[PDB]
Design a protein around this nucleic acid. Sequence first.
RNA 1: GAGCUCCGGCUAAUUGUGUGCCAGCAGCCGCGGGAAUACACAAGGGGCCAGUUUAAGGUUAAAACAAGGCAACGGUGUUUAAAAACUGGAAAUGC
RNA 2: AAAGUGUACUUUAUAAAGUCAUUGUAUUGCUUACAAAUAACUAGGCAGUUGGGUCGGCUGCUAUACUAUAGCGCCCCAAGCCUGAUAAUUAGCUAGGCGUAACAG
RNA 3: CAUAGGGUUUGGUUUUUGCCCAGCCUUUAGCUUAGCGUUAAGCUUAUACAUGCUAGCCUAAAAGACGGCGCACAGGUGCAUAUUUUGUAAGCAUGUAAAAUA
Lengths: 55, 114, 55, 123, 130, 123
Amino acid sequence: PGXXXXXXXXXXXXXXXXXXXXXXXXXXXXXXXXXXXXXXXXXXXXXXXXXXXXX
Amino acid sequence: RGHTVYHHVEHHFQRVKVTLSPRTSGWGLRCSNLFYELCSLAGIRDLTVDVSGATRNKFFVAKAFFDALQKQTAPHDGVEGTGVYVKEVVRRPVVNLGTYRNNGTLPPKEYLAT
Amino acid sequence: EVAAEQAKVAFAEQKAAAEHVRRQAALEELLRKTEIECQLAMVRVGRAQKAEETG
Amino acid sequence: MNNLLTQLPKHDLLKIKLVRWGFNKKPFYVLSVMKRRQARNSGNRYEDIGWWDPSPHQDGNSHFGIKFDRVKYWLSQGAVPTEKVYGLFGQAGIIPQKPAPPKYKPADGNADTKWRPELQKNL
Amino acid sequence: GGFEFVGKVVSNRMQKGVVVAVNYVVWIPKYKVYERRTARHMAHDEGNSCVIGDIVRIQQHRKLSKNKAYVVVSTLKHADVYNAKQAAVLNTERSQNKLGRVEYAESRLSEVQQRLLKLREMYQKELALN
Amino acid sequence: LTVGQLLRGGRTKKVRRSKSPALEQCPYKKGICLRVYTTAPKKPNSANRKVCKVQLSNGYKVLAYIPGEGHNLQEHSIVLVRGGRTKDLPGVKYKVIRGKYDCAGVKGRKTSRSKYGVKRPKE
RNA sequence: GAGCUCCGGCUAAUUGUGUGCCAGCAGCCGCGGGAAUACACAAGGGGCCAGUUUAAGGUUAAAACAAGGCAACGGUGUUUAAAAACUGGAAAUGC
RNA sequence: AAAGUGUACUUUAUAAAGUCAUUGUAUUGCUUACAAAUAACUAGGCAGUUGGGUCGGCUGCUAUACUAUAGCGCCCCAAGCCUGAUAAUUAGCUAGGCGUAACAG
RNA sequence: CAUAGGGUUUGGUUUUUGCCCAGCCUUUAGCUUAGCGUUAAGCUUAUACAUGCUAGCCUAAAAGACGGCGCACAGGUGCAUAUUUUGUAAGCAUGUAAAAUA
Ligand SMILES: [K+]
Ligand SMILES: [K+]
Ligand SMILES: [K+]
Ligand SMILES: [K+]
Ligand SMILES: [Mg+2]
Ligand SMILES: [Mg+2]
Ligand SMILES: [Mg+2]
Ligand SMILES: [Mg+2]
Ligand SMILES: [Mg+2]
Ligand SMILES: [Mg+2]
Ligand SMILES: [Mg+2]
Ligand SMILES: [Mg+2]
Ligand SMILES: [Mg+2]
């Protein structure tokens, strides 16, 4: 999307929008911050959010 | 012509920098007192000299000035191998745009042509 | 008005000339790259025959 | 900086006026096209058209310069010269002289000393 | 300035509206460089069918709302949109049959040769026009 | 620095402080004396230098040195203060101008009378 | 002709008398402890001149875009890294 | 229009004129873009807020453009808009002008 | 019409960094000062103000503005204002539209 973009590409007028890109771009906002944890506790969530075929 | 240098010279003696800029005949000398005395001995009449760096030791400053004068090149160096006639020409030097604006003057017409 | 009309005609002629120059240049570059690809393809065929013997 | 005005006034008149550009008791004037109601030496102008030196020189004459082509242009557009400018144009032969009304008031007996206290101190 | 722009579509969430991003440079006299900057402009879309990621051309127009004073004139490039049905057909073709080392290499060589031959003919025509 | 660093406020102009901050960028300042006493200089000097504590019209209090030989300054005396630092006295950065409202010039001075507020003898 | 200021060095311009780390001078380095061209006075001399000498501001005597350092002191514990800037590359599999 | 018009006003054995009142081909214009000091020990801001539809937006008296600045205001509808944003400190701006070889200040 | 350096850090030398001085421009303070002509100018307070003055002229439905024209011009200041402004550039439909000249 780049610097001036706020949503993902290939989004039609009928298709829905999400906040996945806003979190990545404006990551400094306190609303998106979390607490310190272990590597597995932080990596497992990200891995599942990209593959929808894993329970 | 026995009064200035052939072209711009920049020399780097250890921890000293010296610059020499030619000037038109009769313009005068613009340099420090030490270099003014040296120019009188050699016969230089029109030149601008700027020295910077670690100038505490005056032996180095004089040595750097001496070496700079020996780095010039002349139009007659190996002229036999060129196959041409190296002819002296008359061309007035120019100044930068800021100098013209402050003084309220114009450059040569060859450049203002429009 | 007369001068303006001539300028518009001049602009159209200049644009057409520029487009022709670019099109020829693009074709020349593409032809050279395709030739390089063809040479590599011929090399690969020889390796494929050699590899089949090892199998 | 002093870009000349292009749009004509909508509620006032254009005039050709004299602008004081002299020194102490050494007047010198410049003629320009300006709005009727303004400061005397305002920088708002449409064009500068001439100059005038009212004092005599060694040759015994006064000197006046003017743009002949541009004076006609502004007179056509509607610019109205002042009384003194009419006198200059009349003598220079640009336009016919403008008649003046009859005068009955006894003229002033002290015109060059009434307003100069330095002379009155000696008087 | 600001009569016409070409930019990328970054928002189609409004009714007959769109936001387009623009790049431009500014001269910094003190450091003798051009500084790259960006801006966002809202434009009117009569078709109301734009897709995020398209390259469009916008032109100055009469003010329509508080922040909308431009109109979309043309589209220079259409954004790609994923289509599951078409992708499934391609996967079936790829899995339908397989070739060996030699057969695949020979097929690749033949395809390149045919493409090269056609390109040569087009280049000669271009020279003839010249 | 890189081009990016220079664009993002890389260079900051150096800031230099004044030597007489109590003057608020003024050549002089009026005040009233609070205490008059003497102090000893630092090494290697030795003397009893005359100083006074003055409250300026802006409310600040500073130490001022009294030049010359002898003075008539007491508490509650109006004086004028200028810049100037006495090197051997620590913390003294101002001096009293002599010959002004209350301070008088050195008696018997013949040379540099202006710097000590002494008029030229008519006799 | 008339005043103001200065005469150890940077910086053009010296002798005498008084004082004795006292009185005082001082933009910087510094002078004064009984033999002071630096303090005070007299004479002589230098500079500017109906002006002259302090104090306080702007700018220059390259703060470094033309043009400074991390080698006197400064590179941060390491790695991962969808903004920005710059910009093609030699990866994966099997006993 | 430095003009025309009048059951109008003023001066004349000398008269040309001015004064007052009224009249213009649409009868006095809105909008957008770029640049311009510090500032993160200011990180979230906005709900008429972002966009769409009906209605209103007066001072008349050429004809069309399907209503021809605008959340400028009411009602209704959809959730969007900004993110070195928002909040602070300081200053009237342009420019002549003063220093500098220039750039800069 | 075109770029000048010097002093200082006390075993010596080299090297790095800091400090001070020489120019031009602008206001006050000390001492001192005859006259005439003239250029450019009034650099702190949007602190509080005695007194005089700065915009009036003309005409008349019964000797009088109530009517006409000006005060929409000049002169003063920089409180507020970081953009509401300032400095620039760009955009805004039509053969100006009717009528037998049959
Ligand atoms: K003394
Ligand atoms: K550490
Ligand atoms: K004031
Ligand atoms: K009237
Ligand atoms: Mg841990
Ligand atoms: Mg130098
Ligand atoms: Mg003295
Ligand atoms: Mg000497
Ligand atoms: Mg001395
Ligand atoms: Mg002495
Ligand atoms: Mg203010
Ligand atoms: Mg100078
Ligand atoms: Mg009237």
